[PDB]
Amino acid sequence: IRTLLRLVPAEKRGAVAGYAVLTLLSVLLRAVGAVLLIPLLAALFSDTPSDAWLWLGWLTAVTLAGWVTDTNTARLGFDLGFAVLSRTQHDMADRLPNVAMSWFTPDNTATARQAIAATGPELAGLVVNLLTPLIGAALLPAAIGVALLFVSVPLGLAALAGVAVLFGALALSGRLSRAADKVAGETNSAFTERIIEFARTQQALRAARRVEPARSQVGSALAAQHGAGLRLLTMQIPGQVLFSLAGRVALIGFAGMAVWLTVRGQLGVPEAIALIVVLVRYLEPFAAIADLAPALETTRATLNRIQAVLDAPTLPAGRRRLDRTGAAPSIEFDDVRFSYGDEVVLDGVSFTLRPGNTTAIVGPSGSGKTTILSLIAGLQQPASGRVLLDGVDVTTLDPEARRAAVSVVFQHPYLFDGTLRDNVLVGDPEADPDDVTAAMRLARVDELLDRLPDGDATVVGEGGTALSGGERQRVSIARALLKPAPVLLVDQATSALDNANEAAVVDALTADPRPRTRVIVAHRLASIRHADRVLFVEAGRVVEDGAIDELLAAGGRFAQFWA
Amino acid sequence: AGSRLLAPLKKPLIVSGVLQALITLIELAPFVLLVELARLLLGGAEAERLWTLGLTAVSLIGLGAVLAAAMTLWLHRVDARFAHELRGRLLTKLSRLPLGWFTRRGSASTKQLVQDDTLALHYLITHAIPDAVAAVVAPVAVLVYLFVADWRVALVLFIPVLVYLVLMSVMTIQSGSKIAQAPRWAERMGGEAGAFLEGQPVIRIFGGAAASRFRRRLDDYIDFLVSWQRPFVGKKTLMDLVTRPATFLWIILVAGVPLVVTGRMDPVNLLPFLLLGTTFGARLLGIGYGLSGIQTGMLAARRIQTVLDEPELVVRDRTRPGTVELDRVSFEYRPGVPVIRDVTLTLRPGTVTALVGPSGSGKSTLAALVARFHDVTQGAIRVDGRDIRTLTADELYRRVGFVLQDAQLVHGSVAENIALAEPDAGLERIRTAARDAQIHDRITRMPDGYDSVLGAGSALSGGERQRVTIARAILADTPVLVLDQATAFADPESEYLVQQAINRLTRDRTVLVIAHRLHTITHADQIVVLDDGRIVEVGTHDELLAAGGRYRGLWDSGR
Ligand SMILES: Nc1ncnc2c1ncn2[C@@H]1O[C@H](COP(=O)(O)OP(=O)(O)OP(=O)(O)O)[C@@H](O)[C@H]1O
Numbered sequence A: 001i002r003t004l005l006r007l008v009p010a011e012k013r014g015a016v017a018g019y020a021v022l023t024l025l026s027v028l029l030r031a032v033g034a035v036l037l038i039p040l041l042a043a044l045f046s047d048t049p050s051d052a053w054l055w056l057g058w059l060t061a062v063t064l065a066g067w068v069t070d071t072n073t074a075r076l077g078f079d080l081g082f083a084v085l086s087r088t089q090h091d092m093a094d095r096l097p098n099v100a101m102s103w104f105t106p107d108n109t110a111t112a113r114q115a116i117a118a119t120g121p122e123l124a125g126l127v128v129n130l131l132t133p134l135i136g137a138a139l140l141p142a143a144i145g146v147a148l149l150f151v152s153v154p155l156g157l158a159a160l161a162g163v164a165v166l167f168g169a170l171a172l173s174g175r176l177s178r179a180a181d182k183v184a185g186e187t188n189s190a191f192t193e194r195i196i197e198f199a200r201t202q203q204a205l206r207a208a209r210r211v212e213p214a215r216s217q218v219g220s221a222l223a224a225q226h227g228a229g230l231r232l233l234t235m236q237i238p239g240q241v242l243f244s245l246a247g248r249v250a251l252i253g254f255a256g257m258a259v260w261l262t263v264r265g266q267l268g269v270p271e272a273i274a275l276i277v278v279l280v281r282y283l284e285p286f287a288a289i290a291d292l293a294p295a296l297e298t299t300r301a302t303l304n305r306i307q308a309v310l311d312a313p314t315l316p317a318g319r320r321r322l323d324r325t326g327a328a329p330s331i332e333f334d335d336v337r338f339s340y341g342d343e344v345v346l347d348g349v350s351f352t353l354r355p356g357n358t359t360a361i362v363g364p365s366g367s368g369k370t371t372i373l374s375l376i377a378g379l380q381q382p383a384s385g386r387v388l389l390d391g392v393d394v395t396t397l398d399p400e401a402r403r404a405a406v407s408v409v410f411q412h413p414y415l416f417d418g419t420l421r422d423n424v425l426v427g428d429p430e431a432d433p434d435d436v437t438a439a440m441r442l443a444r445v446d447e448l449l450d451r452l453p454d455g456d457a458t459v460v461g462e463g464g465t466a467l468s469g470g471e472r473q474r475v476s477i478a479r480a481l482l483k484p485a486p487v488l489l490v491d492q493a494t495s496a497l498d499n500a501n502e503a504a505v506v507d508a509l510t511a512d513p514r515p516r517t518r519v520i521v522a523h524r525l526a527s528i529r530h531a532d533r534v535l536f537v538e539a540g541r542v543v544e545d546g547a548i549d550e551l552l553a554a555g556g557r558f559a560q561f562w563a
Numbered sequence B: 001a002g003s004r005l006l007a008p009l010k011k012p013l014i015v016s017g018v019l020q021a022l023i024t025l026i027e028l029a030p031f032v033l034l035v036e037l038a039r040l041l042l043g044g045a046e047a048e049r050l051w052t053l054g055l056t057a058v059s060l061i062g063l064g065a066v067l068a069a070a071m072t073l074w075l076h077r078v079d080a081r082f083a084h085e086l087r088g089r090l091l092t093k094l095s096r097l098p099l100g101w102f103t104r105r106g107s108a109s110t111k112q113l114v115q116d117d118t119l120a121l122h123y124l125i126t127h128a129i130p131d132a133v134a135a136v137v138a139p140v141a142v143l144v145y146l147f148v149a150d151w152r153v154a155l156v157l158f159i160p161v162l163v164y165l166v167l168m169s170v171m172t173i174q175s176g177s178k179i180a181q182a183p184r185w186a187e188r189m190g191g192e193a194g195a196f197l198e199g200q201p202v203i204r205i206f207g208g209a210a211a212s213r214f215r216r217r218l219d220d221y222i223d224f225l226v227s228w229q230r231p232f233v234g235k236k237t238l239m240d241l242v243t244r245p246a247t248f249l250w251i252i253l254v255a256g257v258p259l260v261v262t263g264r265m266d267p268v269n270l271l272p273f274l275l276l277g278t279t280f281g282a283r284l285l286g287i288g289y290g291l292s293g294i295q296t297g298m299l300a301a302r303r304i305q306t307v308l309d310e311p312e313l314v315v316r317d318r319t320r321p322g323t324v325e326l327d328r329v330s331f332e333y334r335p336g337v338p339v340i341r342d343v344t345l346t347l348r349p350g351t352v353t354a355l356v357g358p359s360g361s362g363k364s365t366l367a368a369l370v371a372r373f374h375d376v377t378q379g380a381i382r383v384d385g386r387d388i389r390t391l392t393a394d395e396l397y398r399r400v401g402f403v404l405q406d407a408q409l410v411h412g413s414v415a416e417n418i419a420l421a422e423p424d425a426g427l428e429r430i431r432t433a434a435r436d437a438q439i440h441d442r443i444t445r446m447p448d449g450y451d452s453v454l455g456a457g458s459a460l461s462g463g464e465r466q467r468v469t470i471a472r473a474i475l476a477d478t479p480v481l482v483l484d485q486a487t488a489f490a491d492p493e494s495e496y497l498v499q500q501a502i503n504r505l506t507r508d509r510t511v512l513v514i515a516h517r518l519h520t521i522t523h524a525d526q527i528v529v530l531d532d533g534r535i536v537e538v539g540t541h542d543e544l545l546a547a548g549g550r551y552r553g554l555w556d557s558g559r
C-alpha cells in the first residue's frame, strides 16, 4: 500500500489519517455488533428474557455508529480516490511536456498512454471499491476474534488462528499469481499498442497484406494476450483453492472449539446458536478477500505505471529571460556536440546567425539539420556545448519564455483532431481574427477555405489525415506564422506543396512583417530564394557557408548539391 | 444487437442460471437444517439423534460459496474465450471496412472498440445471470420461509428490502444516462491522450502543458466522472448499509426482542430469522451493484454488433496484364463533397505516368482508389482487366504496390518494416532492397544493424524513413507500382539515386508517379494534370509546356 500513499497529495494526508481511523473503527464496530448477539441470545433465551433490553440497546448504538462511520469512510474514500486521480493526472500532464524527448521510447510511450488511460472510474473509485472492502474483510475476522475473547478466551484464540490461516492463504495466493499477472499486463499493453498501430498504419498494412489476424502483428498480439490471460486464469485457480481451504480450516477450528466449549458446559446452547450466526459473519470475509485479492495486482501495476511516469527525468530549466522585448535574437552554436544515444549527430558545429536575417540550412539526408532546428527550439539539449539565444544559454532560459521565443514548422506536420481553425489557433489562442486571417493568407490556407465545404471549421482527422499532405502542411505553416515569436524555424515546409503554393508560401515566409530571425531547411533551391546566408550541414558539420550567389560562383558543395 | 452478439453464449448462461439457483439453494441448505436441529435441541430432543445431522450441517456451511467460486472460475474461462473470438472477429471486420471508417473514427476509438468494449462484456457474461438468479431465488425463498415461519418479523424484513429496491431504482435511473455518455468520454480522452503523446513537439513549442487541449479535456472528463460517481457511490454505499447482515440482524432483533419479552413470540421461533434472515442481503446487493455492469455490457455489445454489421469492401462475383484502367471514376469522401470528378485514365505496362497538379487536387485519393481503400462512387477501376471490386485483397495487392505520401513505419526492426509485404523474405533480399533505396548504408551505421527497432521516439529522419518505405515497396516487387509523392524529403543526390533505382526496377512495369517537383517527371511518357478532381490536360512534358495551360504555370512558378 506504500505505492498508493506515495501518490496522495501532501495536503490530503489528514484525510488519509481520518479514513484509516474510521476504517479501523468501522471494523471494530462490526465485530462488536456481531459478538454482542451472544449475550443478547443468552439473555433472551434465559428464564428472565427482559435482560436482553440492555444488549439490544448496545446493539442499536453500535449499529448506528457503524452506519455513521461507514458513510463517512465512503465519503473519505471517494474524496481520496478522486483527489489522487486529479493530482496524478494533472502532474503527468504538467510533467510530460518537460520530460526529455529520449524518454519517449515505445515502452515508455505505452506506459504513459496506459497511465493516462487510467483516468476512468476504475481508478477514481479505487478506495471505495478495493481498499475499503479489502481492509474491512481482512480485519473483520481478526476483530471478531478479539471481540470473542471477552466471551471466551479459547474461542477467540481459535478465531484468531483462523485469521492467521487466512492471512497465510492471502500471501500465498498473491505470490502464486504474481508472474502470471505481470505477463498478462505486459501482453495486454502490447495488444493495446498494436491496436493503435493497426488503426494508424491501416493503409500500409493493407497494402502489405499484414492486416488479417492470421498475418497481422495485432493478431499475434491478440494470440499472446489470450495465452497470457488464460495462464493468469489458470494460476488464480490455486489461489481460490487455497482461500477455500483456509475457509474450511477456519470453520473447522471455530466450530470445533464452540462445540467443545458447549459440550464442557462453558457455553450455553443459545450462546452456541448465536455463535452459528457469528461464525457466518466470520466466514463471509474469507470469500470477499478471495474475490478482491486478484484486483490487487492490476491496481498495483496501474499505480506503478503512474508513479513511473511521474518519475521521468525532466529537462534542465533555469530562470533566465531574454532582455530585449520582442527583438530578433542572435542565434549561435558554440562547440555544440549532440548524439542520439551512441550515434554522434553533431560534433563541433559552431556558427553565429545574425539577428533579424534569414538563414538557410541545406545538405544530404541524415546530415543533422532537423537536429540543429530542434536544438535551437529547445526540443533537444546539447550533450556538450551551449546554444545561445541573444547570448543567453537556452538551457538556463525559463521554459515559459523559452517556448515563447521560438516557433517551428516541423518536417512532418502534425495537427490535432478537431477543426482546421483550432489548429491554426494553437500558435496564439487569443490572437485577433485579423491576425489569424493574415496568418492563413500568408500560408495560403485561405485557398482551402473557399474550396473545402466547411471552411476553416472543417474537422481534421487524427493528425492531418483528413487533409492532403500539402493542406496540413499549410495549416502547420499558418500555425507557426500566427505565433509572434522572434525566431522562426522552417523545416521542409515546402515538401508537399505544388509550385504555385510553394512559391507563395516562400514569399510569405520572407514577406512576413514581424521581425524574426529565420532558419530554413529545404531540399528545393526555390525554397531558399530569399535566404541571406546558407549553412551546408553534412554529417554533422557546417562544411560550407556563405551567401547563395557567392557559393554558387565558388563552385563548392552548394552547387554540387543543387547540380 | 446485444442479443444477436451474445447468442453463442445462450446455453452457458442458462447453465449458469440453473447452477446458481442450485448453488443458492445449497447455501440456504445448512441453515434450514441447523434451524430444525436447534428447534429439536431446545425442545428437549436427545442429542444422540442430532450429532450426525449437526456435523453435516455445520460442515455444509460455505460449501455453496466454494461451488460459486468454481462456477465463476469456469465462467471466467468462458468469457475469456468468447472475448478472444470476439476480438478476432473485430480485427477481421476492421481489415475489410473502407478507410473512411478509420479516418472518421480515429485510432483511440478503434482501441476502445477492440479492448474496452469487449472487456465491458465481462460482467454481463461472468456474473449477470448468476447475480440475477441468485437475487431472485435466495431473497424470495428466504422471505417465503420466514413469512410462513412468522409473518410479523417478515414484515419488518420487508422494510429494508423495499428501501433497497427504491434505492436501486433511483440509482439506475440517475446513472443510466451517465453510463451511456461514459464510453464517448472514454474514447475522447483516449484520443486526446494519444494526440498529446504523438504531438509532443507541437505541444512543447506551442503553448506547453498549460494551453494544451489535453488538460482541458482532462479537467472536463474529471468533472464528468465526479458528477457521475458521487451520487452513484453514495447510492451504492446506502444500498450496502440497507442490505448489510448487521442491518437485517438489528431489524430482526428490534422486531423480535419486544415480541419475545412479551408472551407473543417464543424465543425458539427467532432462530429462522437469525440463521437465514441475514444471508440474502448480499444476494440483493449483487444485482444492485450489477445493474450498472449490465448496462455497460449491453451498450458495449450494441457497439460491437453495430461495427460488425457495417458495410465492408465486399468482393463481387462479376470476375493487357499489368494494365490499370480508371473508367469514368468518381469518388466522394463525404456525401455530396466530390474529390474526383469523372476521371478516365489508363496506365499501361512499360510506361511511367506522372500525376501532377495543385495541392488538394485529388492525386492521393486517386492512388487510394487504385488501392481500393475506398470504393469508387461511379465508374470502375480494373487491373489486368479484372475489376478491383472482384479481386480479393490478396489478388489485388499482389498486383499493385504503393509508396504512400505519409511514410508509416511499424513498431519493429528495420528488417521488418522493409519486407513488411513479404515477412519471410531472406535477409539478402532485404539488403538488396535497402541498397536500391540507398538506406542500406544508413542501416549499417545503426547499433544492432538490421534488427534495430523503429518504434515511437526511436525514429529516423524523414528522408530516411521515406527511403525505408521505398525499400518496402521495392521488396514487394509488384507488377504495378504507385509512388504517392515519393522522394519529397529526399535530397537531390538521394532523390536522383532512388529515381535511378526505381527506373531500373520498373522498366517493363506500370508506374504511376505523383510529384510536386515537376523537374523529376520530365521523362514521364504520359503526364496527367489533375486540377480540382478532374483531369484538365494530358500529354508529354514538351507538349504540356507548349500548350500553355496549368502545367506551364506550375513549371514557371517553380523556377
Ligand atoms: N528519434 C531519433 N532517435 C534516434 N536517432 C534519430 C532520431 N531522429 C533522428 N535520428 C538520427 O539523427 C541523424 C540526423 O537526424 P535529423 O533528424 O537531424 O536528419 P536531417 O538532417 O533533418 O535529415 P532529412 O534531410 O532526411 O530530413 C540521422 O542519423 C537520424 O537517423
Ligand SMILES: Nc1ncnc2c1ncn2[C@@H]1O[C@H](COP(=O)(O)OP(=O)(O)OP(=O)(O)O)[C@@H](O)[C@H]1O
Pocket (backbone or CB within 6 Å): A452, A461, A465, A466, A467, A468, A469, A470, A471, A496, A497, A498, B100, B103, B333, B334, B339, B358, B359, B360, B361, B362, B363, B364, B365, B366, B405, B485
Ligand atoms: N480521409 C479524408 N477524409 C476527407 N477528406 C479527405 C480525406 N483525405 C483527403 N481529403 C480531401 O481530399 C481532397 C484531395 O486531397 P488529396 O490528398 O487526395 O490530394 P493530393 O493531390 O494528394 O494533395 P497534396 O498535393 O496535398 O498531397 C482535399 O480536399 C482533402 O481535404
Ligand SMILES: [Mg+2]
Pocket (backbone or CB within 6 Å): A369, A370, A371, A411, B461, B462, B463
Ligand atoms: Mg530533417
Ligand SMILES: [Mg+2]
Pocket (backbone or CB within 6 Å): A468, A469, A470, B363, B364, B405, B485
Ligand atoms: Mg497527397
